[PDB]
Amino acid sequence: TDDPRLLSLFSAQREEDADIVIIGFPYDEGCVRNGGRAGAKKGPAAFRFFLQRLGSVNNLELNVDASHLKLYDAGDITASTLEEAHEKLESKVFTVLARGAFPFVIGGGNDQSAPNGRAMLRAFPGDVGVINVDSHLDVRPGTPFRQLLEESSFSGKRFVEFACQGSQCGALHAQYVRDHQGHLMWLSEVRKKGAVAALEDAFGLTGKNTFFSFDVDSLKSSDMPGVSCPAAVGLSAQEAFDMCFLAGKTPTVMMMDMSELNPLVEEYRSPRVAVYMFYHFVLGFATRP
Amino acid sequence: TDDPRLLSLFSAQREEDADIVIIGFPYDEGCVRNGGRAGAKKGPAAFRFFLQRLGSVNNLELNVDASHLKLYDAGDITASTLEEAHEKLESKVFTVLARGAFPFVIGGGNDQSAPNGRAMLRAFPGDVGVINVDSHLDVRPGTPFRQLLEESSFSGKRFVEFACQGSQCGALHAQYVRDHQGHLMWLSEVRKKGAVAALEDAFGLTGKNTFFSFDVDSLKSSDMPGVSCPAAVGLSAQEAFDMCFLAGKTPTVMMMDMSELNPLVEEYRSPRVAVYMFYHFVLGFATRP
Amino acid sequence: TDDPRLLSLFSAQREEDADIVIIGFPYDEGCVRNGGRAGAKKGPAAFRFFLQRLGSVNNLELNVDASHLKLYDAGDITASTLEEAHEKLESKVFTVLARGAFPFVIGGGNDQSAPNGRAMLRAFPGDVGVINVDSHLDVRPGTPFRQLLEESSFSGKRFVEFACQGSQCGALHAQYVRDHQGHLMWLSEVRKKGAVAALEDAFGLTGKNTFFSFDVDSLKSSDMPGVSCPAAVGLSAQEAFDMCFLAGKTPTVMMMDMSELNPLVEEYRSPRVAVYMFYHFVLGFATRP
Numbered sequence: 001t002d003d004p005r006l007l008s009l010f011s012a013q014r015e016e017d018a019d020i021v022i023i024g025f026p027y028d029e030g031c032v033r034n035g036g037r038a039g040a041k042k043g044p045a046a047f048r049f050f051l052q053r054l055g056s057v058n059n060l061e062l063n064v065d066a067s068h069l070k071l072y073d074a075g076d077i078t079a080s081t082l083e084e085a086h087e088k089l090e091s092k093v094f095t096v097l098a099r100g101a102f103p104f105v106i107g108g109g110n111d112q113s114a115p116n117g118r119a120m121l122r123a124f125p126g127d128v129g130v131i132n133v134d135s136h137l138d139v140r141p142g143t144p145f146r147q148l149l150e151e152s153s154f155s156g157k158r159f160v161e162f163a164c165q166g167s168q169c170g171a172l173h174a175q176y177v178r179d180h181q182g183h184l185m186w187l188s189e190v191r192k193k194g195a196v197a198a199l200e201d202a203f204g205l206t207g208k209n210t211f212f213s214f215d216v217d218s219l220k221s222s223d224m225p226g227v228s229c230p231a232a233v234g235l236s237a238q239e240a241f242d243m244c245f246l247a248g249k250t251p252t253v254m255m256m257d258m259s260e261l262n263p264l265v266e267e268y269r270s271p272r273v274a275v276y277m278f279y280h281f282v283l284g285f286a287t288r289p
Numbered sequence: 290t291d292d293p294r295l296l297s298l299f300s301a302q303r304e305e306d307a308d309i310v311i312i313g314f315p316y317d318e319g320c321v322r323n324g325g326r327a328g329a330k331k332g333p334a335a336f337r338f339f340l341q342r343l344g345s346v347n348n349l350e351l352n353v354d355a356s357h358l359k360l361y362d363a364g365d366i367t368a369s370t371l372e373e374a375h376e377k378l379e380s381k382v383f384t385v386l387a388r389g390a391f392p393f394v395i396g397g398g399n400d401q402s403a404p405n406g407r408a409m410l411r412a413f414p415g416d417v418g419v420i421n422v423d424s425h426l427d428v429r430p431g432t433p434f435r436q437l438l439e440e441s442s443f444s445g446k447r448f449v450e451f452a453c454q455g456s457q458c459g460a461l462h463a464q465y466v467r468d469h470q471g472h473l474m475w476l477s478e479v480r481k482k483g484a485v486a487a488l489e490d491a492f493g494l495t496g497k498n499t500f501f502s503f504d505v506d507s508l509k510s511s512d513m514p515g516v517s518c519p520a521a522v523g524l525s526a527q528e529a530f531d532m533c534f535l536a537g538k539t540p541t542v543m544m545m546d547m548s549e550l551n552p553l554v555e556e557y558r559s560p561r562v563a564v565y566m567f568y569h570f571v572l573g574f575a576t577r578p
Numbered sequence: 579t580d581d582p583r584l585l586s587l588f589s590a591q592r593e594e595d596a597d598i599v600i601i602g603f604p605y606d607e608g609c610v611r612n613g614g615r616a617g618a619k620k621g622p623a624a625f626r627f628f629l630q631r632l633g634s635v636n637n638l639e640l641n642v643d644a645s646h647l648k649l650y651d652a653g654d655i656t657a658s659t660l661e662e663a664h665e666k667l668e669s670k671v672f673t674v675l676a677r678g679a680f681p682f683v684i685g686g687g688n689d690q691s692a693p694n695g696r697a698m699l700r701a702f703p704g705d706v707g708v709i710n711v712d713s714h715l716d717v718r719p720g721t722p723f724r725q726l727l728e729e730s731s732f733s734g735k736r737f738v739e740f741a742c743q744g745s746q747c748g749a750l751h752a753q754y755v756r757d758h759q760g761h762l763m764w765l766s767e768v769r770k771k772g773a774v775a776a777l778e779d780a781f782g783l784t785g786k787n788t789f790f791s792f793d794v795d796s797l798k799s800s801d802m803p804g805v806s807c808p809a810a811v812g813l814s815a816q817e818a819f820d821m822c823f824l825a826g827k828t829p830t831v832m833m834m835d836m837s838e839l840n841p842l843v844e845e846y847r848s849p850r851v852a853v854y855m856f857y858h859f860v861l862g863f864a865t866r867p
């Protein structure tokens with residue numbers, strides 16, 4: 001038609017021909033256990049629904065044409081047990097990374113990020129950086145970033161907790177991260193600096209081979225109500241878009257996941273924001289040398 | 290009582306005695322066809338409900354007393370066919386314009402703006418300007434602003450697309466407008482300048498006899514969820530109010546319409562925002578020499 | 579556990595051992611009569627639900643540890659008539675004030691603030707200040723702040739209407755307050771100065787023995803939908819949190835109430851904001867000398 005969108009970029013005959021490979025992980029586990037709502041397992045389907053519909057490939061506002069990129073949907077990870085599921089997810093993400101392609105994983109709960117981080121650690125031995133964009137720390141004794149901070153080959157100096165909220169983070173949890181030389185960038189600090197500026201600082205710390213992990217409950221619930229654990233304050237939709245674009249254009253960002261989208265909580269506005277976030281990553285990615 | 294509101298301004302015996310005449314257009318057609326939801330036809334009723342209830346006529350915050358203005362509700366345009374409806378709407382708006390009064394048209398979908406623009410072109414031959422405040426371009430091969438850009442007597446140099454969004458606008462659509470010498474003012478640009486400042490610039494371009502056309506899906510859905518095509522990002526409610534006040538006080542603005550209000554999507558918060566927008570236009574209008 | 583929250587502060591054996599005493603007032607009366615929705619009577623229960631769940635006692639973002647404070651829930655005021663209820667509320671708040679402890683009253687509608695103000699006037703004869711944080715004036719011929727402005731011992735020079743909205747305030751109502759030497763700080767003015775800066779100015783006017791009265795319909799409905807009279811524009815959640823923290827740390831603030839929380843309108847996001855507001859007051863209070 002006269003307005004080609006993301007759907008039009010799925011021109012890859014086979015997965016191997018794609019720049020960016022989408023992988024779904026339809027499992028609840030994550031913030032639901034921290035008082036949250038069940039339903040994140042429906043995130044990949046809701047994301048797909050709007051993936052079919054949104055995102056002008058040539059954006060004349062940002063002046064970026066993403067026409068040359070090829071996307072591929074590898075479908076959902078399927079398994080009879082959550083443990084097998086985690087294993088299959090890790091293995092899949094690794095194979096995509098190993099051939100130099102970019103895996104984007106749509107969840108599903110936070111727990112997906114542990115297998116995703118492990119694929120990273122395997123693919124770039126001893127040279128991974130990780131940012132967790134999250135209103136929560138996700139480090140309770142398990143939580144995905146405690147699992148990764150406990151990895152021998154991962155340097156905590158290259159771990160950033162981004163847009164975390166003091167009202168939602170235990171002293172013991174902050175202490176654990178900092179004792180591992182990790183960095184806390186509180187919401188107030190991100191707001192003060194500007195979200196993109198602060199994320200630039202974050203990527204400076206994470207360095208090469210960065211896992212950009214985006215828990216969407218880091219967004220204020222006024223923009224992003226449909227998450228397992230809705231935030232009273234947090235990132236705006238525009239800040240999220242702007243951050244996603246930066247991550248897209250930053251050559252050191254080697255994979256992304258997106259956790260906690262929960263259509264049982266809210267099913268129309270929130271999945272659209274999620275797709276628009278991915279869309280901005282795709283535009284940024286289009287500008288990579 | 291001790292707090293006179295908009296309702297109190299409906300003191301006109303007959304329509305001819307009114308400064309501002311309200312006309313309803315209860316038809317869905319507009320963004321519903323671009324993936325949107327049916328229900329905009331219920332906008333005029335929902336608008337009326339809160340019209341009866343809101344808006345202090347003497348506003349001590351802005352220090353504007355709208356007591357001297359007379360409003361009149363001419364009711365809804367009724368017809369057995371959408372085509373006849375468009376014809377009747379155009380004819381009605383024209384008669385209001387022709388006697389020097391101000392028509393405000395509450396929709397209803399975007400399609401209303403084509404008949405509204407035509408009434409303008411008839412009333413001010415070869416000397417009309419038009420601004421479309423819209424997250425979308427509304428120019429697909431039909432869409433109301435393609436119809437008006439195809440009018441012989443309309444100069445595209447005096448057409449502004451205001452607060453449009455790059456994620457939602459085809460390259461072919463931008464190209465069409467610009468090839469007609471029309472102007473795109475992207476949301477990011479409006480945000481950067483300030484909404485009122487940018488609208489001042491817009492009115493500078495539209496010039497005399499300006500049609501101020503406000504598609505409310507230009508507002509972020511956090512403030513304005515009840516529209517056929519809810520926006521993830523967009524104008525805030527305050528920006529919309531501030532813009533409406535400016536339009537009210539700008540003597541070159543000769544009519545206004547308001548499209549896409551959809552109470553089937555959300556029925557309480559959004560119609561209130563719509564009435565408050567009209568209310569701010571009325572305060573601004575009160576200050577016209 | 580590894581993340582102690584507000585619940586952990588309820589260590590007071592008996593009420594007398596508490597720094598802050600929570601009192602519930604489960605009655606609708608307030609903005610419901612100004613076109614609002616019934617249901618504020620459910621506010622205290624909804625507030626309690628999230629009180630059990632939220633708020634890190636040691637906040638590493640703000641670097642305030644509220645561990646030393648003792649909270650106590652005195653339950654709800656119960657009575658066979660609204661009039662008796664008002665009497666019991668006043669009496670209870672007074673006894674808490676009289677022994678130097680801090681009463682926090684969760685409503686329930688605006689009408690609670692009249693008995694609350696009276697307890698203040700009794701406890702600090704002729705030396706009370708009052709701020710009403712409210713999108714509305716609450717002064718109609720009755721409304722709680724007309725009742726207090728009519729008190730012989732109360733100086734209107736020490737009454738501030740904060741974040742009021744011109745679109746929602748009659749000229750006669752503004753006139754009444756100003757004729758009593760009261761001060762109007764319009765939303766636009768609060769926004770221009772910064773919310774905390776403006777509240778500092780307000781506390782400068784209210785002076786000693788200030789009643790901090792927070793009608794949550796002063797918050798924009800994008801953040802705070804669950805109120806009897808939802809606001810199109812207003813304070814953000816962050817502004818409210820920031821204001822509550824300031825009030826907590828300001829030694830002249832001797833009690834607080836919180837009115838208009840309405841879970842019938844919206845039951846999850848809004849009570850969380852209410853608890854987070856109280857939470858910020860508690861952190862601020864923790865820093866009092």
Ligand SMILES: [Mn+2]
Pocket residue numbers: 030031110134136138215259
């Ligand atoms: Mn998380």
Ligand SMILES: [Mn+2]
Pocket residue numbers: 031134135136215217218229260
């Ligand atoms: Mn989270």
Ligand SMILES: [Mn+2]
Pocket residue numbers: 319320399423425427504548
């Ligand atoms: Mn439109």
Ligand SMILES: [Mn+2]
Pocket residue numbers: 320423424425504506507518549
């Ligand atoms: Mn539109």
Ligand SMILES: [Mn+2]
Pocket residue numbers: 608609688712714716793837
């Ligand atoms: Mn009130």
Ligand SMILES: [Mn+2]
Pocket residue numbers: 609712713714793795796807838
């Ligand atoms: Mn109020």
